[PDB]
Amino acid sequence: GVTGHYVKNKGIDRIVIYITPNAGSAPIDLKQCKLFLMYDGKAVSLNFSKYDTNTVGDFTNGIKDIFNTTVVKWNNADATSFVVVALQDDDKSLLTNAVINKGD
Amino acid sequence: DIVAICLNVSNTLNLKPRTKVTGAVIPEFGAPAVISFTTPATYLDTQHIIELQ
Ligand SMILES: [Ca+2]
């Protein structure tokens, strides 16, 4: 899924992309993956960056609003990086060295 | 017979992820056994014993 936030009279300001591993896939080391995006005049590559003080933002137990600034800590999303928020992870793999495995 | 050669490498070789390890056990006579593996891309805390080769 993808979802996004609209500022009035301006356009879409930020986007959140939900990602999951395919059946049977071996674990993926998220912090080495690169995200390429194309649009009307620019083709940009973004690299992983740490959430505040910790590798991945731990919201395994729910978020009041994924876009509210004070709750979520968007600030490290610079013009050249992304950050990762962990939504479901039983085995604590996301939470510790950022590895996606089955069911995350 | 089967027997396990036990080596403690904690300070001698720095086996972090994605690292190639090469070697041989060389007998007094006869052909050497060749050790050759690359450590996994990711180590998980739920799986402390890893099968390398
Ligand atoms: Ca996991």
Side-chain angles (χ1 to χ4, degrees):
Chain A
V2 189
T3 68
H5 187 270
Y6 168 73
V7 172
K8 292 168 188 176
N9 202 239
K10 290 192 191 71
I12 306 179
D13 188 25
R14 293 136 74 200
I15 283 175
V16 178
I17 296 152
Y18 295 115
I19 198 156
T20 53
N22 64 264
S25 57
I28 298 298
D29 183 11
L30 204 55
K31 45 200 184 156
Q32 287 291 118
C33 299
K34 253 63 175 176
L35 167 55
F36 294 95
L37 281 163
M38 294 171 273
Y39 168 60
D40 80 352
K42 295 283 288 170
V44 175
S45 313
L46 303 167
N47 69 310
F48 170 79
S49 59
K50 291 178 71 187
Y51 187 93
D52 187 356
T53 303
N54 302 264
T55 55
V56 169
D58 174 25
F59 289 97
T60 310
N61 308 353
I63 319 184
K64 182 165 167 178
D65 180 31
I66 303 153
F67 290 103
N68 188 307
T69 59
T70 65
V71 177
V72 173
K73 278 189 180 175
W74 273 75
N75 71 330
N76 278 0
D78 288 331
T80 58
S81 76
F82 62 89
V83 292
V84 181
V85 155
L87 290 164
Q88 162 63 16
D89 170 29
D90 174 46
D91 49 280
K92 303 102 176 71
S93 62
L94 298 182
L95 304 183
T96 327
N97 303 318
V99 178
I100 289 184
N101 56 30
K102 291 177 185 182
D104 299 345
Chain B
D1 300 348
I2 303 162
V3 69
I5 290 174
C6 300
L7 287 159
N8 174 335
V9 291
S10 189
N11 292 106
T12 313
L13 301 170
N14 193 4
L15 303 187
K16 60 175 70 191
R18 299 176 180 93
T19 292
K20 191 64 162 67
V21 182
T22 301
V25 177
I26 297 166
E28 190 151 39
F29 64 94
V34 183
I35 289 158
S36 185
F37 54 93
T38 186
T39 54
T42 56
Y43 297 163
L44 296 178
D45 320 79
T46 51
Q47 283 195 98
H48 293 294
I49 288 171
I50 295 179
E51 180 180 73
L52 289 157
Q53 176 185 343

